[PDB]
Amino acid sequence: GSSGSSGGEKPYPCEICGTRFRHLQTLKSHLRIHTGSGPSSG
Ligand SMILES: [Zn+2]
């Protein structure tokens, strides 16, 4: 259906893949594995 908040667990769905995260601040860090071509971020 619609995309956005959920209202329970991981109301902050990822933008790259989609994997949600209990908290937002956390998700932002989950984007590190998504973007990072080279010696940066691994
Ligand atoms: Zn993701």
UniProtKB/Swiss-Prot annotation:
It comes from the Eukaryota. It is found in: Nucleus. A zinc finger (C2H2-type) spans 12-34. Expressed in germinal center T- and B-cells and in primary immature dendritic cells. Induction: Down-regulated during maturation of dendritic cells by selective stimuli such as bacterial lipopolysaccharides (LPS), CD40LG and zymosan. Protein levels decreases upon genotoxic stress in a dose- and time-dependent way. Phosphorylated by ATM in response to genotoxic stress. Phosphorylation induces its degradation by ubiquitin/proteasome pathway. Polyubiquitinated. Polyubiquitinated by SCF(FBXO11), leading to its degradation by the proteasome. Ubiquitinated by the SCF(FBXL17) complex, leading to its degradation by the proteasome: ubiquitination by the SCF(FBXL17) complex takes place when aberrant BTB domain dimers are formed. Homodimer. Interacts (via BTB domain) with the corepressors BCOR, NCOR1 and SMRT/NCOR2; the interactions are direct. Forms preferably ternary complexes with BCOR and SMRT/NCOR2 on target gene promoters but, on enhancer elements, interacts with SMRT/NCOR2 and HDAC3 to repress proximal gene expression. Interacts with histone deacetylases HDAC2, HDAC5 and HDAC9 (via the catalytic domain). Interacts with ZBTB7 and BCL6B. Interacts with SCF(FBXO11) complex; the interaction is independent of phosphorylation and promotes ubiquitination. Transcriptional repressor mainly required for germinal center (GC) formation and antibody affinity maturation which has different mechanisms of action specific to the lineage and biological functions. Forms complexes with different corepressors and histone deacetylases to repress the transcriptional expression of different subsets of target genes. Represses its target genes by binding directly to the DNA sequence 5'-TTCCTAGAA-3' (BCL6-binding site) or indirectly by repressing the transcriptional activity of transcription factors. The BTB domain mediates homodimerization. Its dimer interface mediates peptide binding such as to corepressors BCOR and NCOR2. Interaction with corepressors through the BTB domain is needed to facilitate the rapid proliferation and survival of GC B-cells but is not involved in the T(FH) formation and BCL6-mediated suppression of T(H)2 and T(H)17 differentiationrequired for GC formation. It is linked to Chromosomal aberrations involving BCL6 are a cause of B-cell non-Hodgkin lymphomas (B-cell NHL), including diffuse large B-cell lymphoma and follicular lymphoma. Approximately 40% of diffuse large B-cell lymphomas and 5 to 10% of follicular lymphomas are associated with chromosomal translocations that deregulate expression of BCL6 by juxtaposing heterologous promoters to the BCL6 coding domain. Translocation t(3;14)(q27;q32). Translocation t(3;22)(q27;q11) with immunoglobulin gene regions. Translocation t(3;7)(q27;p12) with IKZF1 gene 5'non-coding region. This is B-cell lymphoma 6 protein. It comes from Homo sapiens. The chain holds residues 626 to 654 of 706 of the full protein.
